[PDB]
């Protein structure tokens, strides 16, 4: 169970599946989730802080 | 039907290979002195470029590339750092 | 908006964007609660 949860957590930042462990920033994943919720139209004034 | 119930046969797609493409989160278009951005209206689609520098869109469930048109984009004022730079000529027809 | 330009926003989050002709469907009739406009005022 702990390995399962760790793998679930680590899969969020995995950029590709066919090769090595290439990662993306967590903020990029958060921005993708935000775009899924609603299409963001203010690119300059990002306030993820 | 089954004793005191039922059985379901679910048929699913099993992938055996992956296509690697270079994807962009948007297009920073510079028409003269007017710089604006274009983002994909459907968040379920991935935008990439072919060998002939033509923009294409594909779903992430299955690799089904299709030519991108202007109606698939939304115009915004600002640009992001991770946007591909382009001019009016390079924009989709 | 203030400049009499039509905008569209999702109801989950306030993310206004400019409206284009491809976002609309044309019908014959009109409703009472529709905003009156001419060809010039229509979105580009
Ligand atoms: C999906 O399968 C097809 C069919 O086997 C693969 O296409 C082959 O690709 C190799 C390598 O370029 C060519 O030598 C063969 O001629 C192709 N076969 C056919 C029938 O076109 C394809 O590469 C696979 N997709 C992958 C591995 O991503
Ligand atoms: C696309 O064009 C923009 C705008 O000119 C480039 O952003 C500049 O990048 C340089 C190098 O990192 C910075 O010093 C500038 O400050 C940036 N300018 C602005 C206005 O942000 C961007 O690098 C270009 N992308 C390419 C060529 O791939
Ligand atoms: C938009 O235009 C329509 C059509 O002219 C207007 O509807 C009229 O409203 C008046 C006042 O209530 C009625 O007496 C007429 O019978 C209506 N006409 C039709 C054809 O339905 C409507 O009021 C206008 N909306 C505005 C100006 O906000």
- Which tokens go with B77? 């004022």
Beta-strand pair B73-76/B45-49: unpaired
**B39 DSSP assignment:** E
Residue bearing tokens 């009739």? C29
CA B89 – CA B47 distance, rounded (Å)? 18
B39 CA distance to ligand 2 middle (Å): 18
Strand-by-strand arrangement of the B55-59 sheet:
B23-24, B45-49, B55-59, B66-67
**C-alpha B17 – ligand 1 centre gap (Å):** 10
- What distance in angstroms lies between residue B27's CA and the mean position of ligand 3's atoms? 44
| Of residues B60, B47, B62, B58, the one with CA closest to residue B92 | B47
Start-to-end CA distance of chain B, whole Å, equals 55
User: Contact, B46 vs B56, CB < 8 A?
Assistant: no
Q: Does C8 touch chain B (CB under 8 A)?
A: no
Backbone angles phi, psi at B57, to 5 degrees: -120, 140
**C neighbours by CB contacts (3+ pairs under 8 Å):** A, B
Pocket of ligand 1 (CB under 6 A): B 17, 19
State whether residue B27 is helix, strand or coil.
Answer: strand
CB atoms within 10 A of CB B78: 16
B21 touches chain A (CB under 8 A): no
| SS3 of residue A12 by DSSP | helix
Out of B13, B14, B15, B17, give the residue to mutate to test ligand 1, the one with the largest number of ligand atoms within 8 Å of its CB.
Answer: B17
Distance, CA of A49 to CA of C20 (rounded, Å): 33
Question: Method used for this model?
Answer: cryo-EM
End-to-end alpha-carbon separation of chain A, Å?
Answer: 32
């Amino acid at each position: 169970m702990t390995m399962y949860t760790a793998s679930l957590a680590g899969g969020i930042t995995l950029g590709a599946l066919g090769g090595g462990a290439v990662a993306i920033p967590f903020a990029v994943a958060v921005q993708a989730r935000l775009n899924y919720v609603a299409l963001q139209t203010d690119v300059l004034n990002k306030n993820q802080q | 039907a089954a004793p005191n119930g039922m059985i379901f046969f679910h048929t699913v797609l099993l992938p055996t290979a992956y296509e690697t493409v270079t994807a962009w989160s948007g297009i920073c278009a510079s028409d003269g002195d007017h710089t604006f951005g274009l983002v994909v209206k459907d968040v379920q689609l991935t935008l990439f470029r072919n060998l002939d520098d033509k923009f294409y869109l594909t779903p992430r469930t299955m690799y089904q590339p299709r030519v991108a048109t202007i109606s698939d984009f939304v115009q915004i004022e600002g640009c992001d750092v991770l946007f591909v730079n382009a001019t009016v000529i390079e924009l989709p027809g």
